[PDB]
Amino acid sequence: GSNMKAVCVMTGTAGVKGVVKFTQETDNGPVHVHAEFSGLKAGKHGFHVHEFGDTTNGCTSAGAHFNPTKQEHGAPEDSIRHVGDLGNVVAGADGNAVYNATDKLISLNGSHSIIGRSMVIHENEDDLGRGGHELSKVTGNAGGRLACGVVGLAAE
Template sequence: MGAIIPGFATSQSQGKMKAVCVMSGSAGVKGVVNFTQDTTDGPVHIHGEFSGLKPGKHGFHVHEFGDTTNGCTSAGAHFNPTNQEHGAPNDSIRHVGDLGNVVATDDGKGVYDATDKLISLSGPHSIIGRTMVIHENEDDLGRGGHDLSKVTGNAGGRVACGVIGLAAD
């Protein structure tokens, strides 16, 4: 696991970039998420490991602000620079920050492992300096029919968060 480097590192902007997010919450939920992008215009591999979750699915999103001064609530809405409706990670219409769900087992542990083509570690879709959030409930991926489905995935409260920072090799 790498250390967080404040700001943007120009030496990483030409090739492989890495970022990390250490997440925590008031209910004992913890996690570490690592991001790797081999080229500036390539997909981002995301690997996260979590503990302290209730069993089941939990919405997992990048939120617009890197602000946790009031816990996870000051992170703002989902990162959505293209002004789209909420959706699933593989949908053509979705927020940039929509990453689906983390699935927790009966022991409260969860693993998220995916590659995403919309988020980036540089440029206009950069997630550096933004906040990762795990939600209390399942993200319905915009298909739940609830008033919040097309906005938040109706995923409920925020149980853990952390700011995404560039990581050393």
């Protein structure tokens, strides 16, 4: 009675799309994340899991960053971060991007489960809460939402 794989197809109306795959060996163990994108402008783009798996009104209805530990916005590596903080996806000159990471806070089970929630890639770079701006400690000052998608359970 525990999930070990999840998938997320991300679309929008900006010419940006991608797919994210998650695998979790144990109930509370780390989660391996792998995403692929196309149509992005060269550079870094904020990448986080939002609280709602609702995409009825673009990516706006997805709400804010999944934050069950009630912390401020940070980098994946920080102790003080939103469970949903996954940092930046890097796109090359061709507009394509490959993202890989192993995270210990997100999960496919329990209270920190992202199943049924949304992944969102932003237009600007996530300053990881260090930018010294108004939204730095809240969203990373990453701006608009290019694409998003609900996170669904994947086959064994």
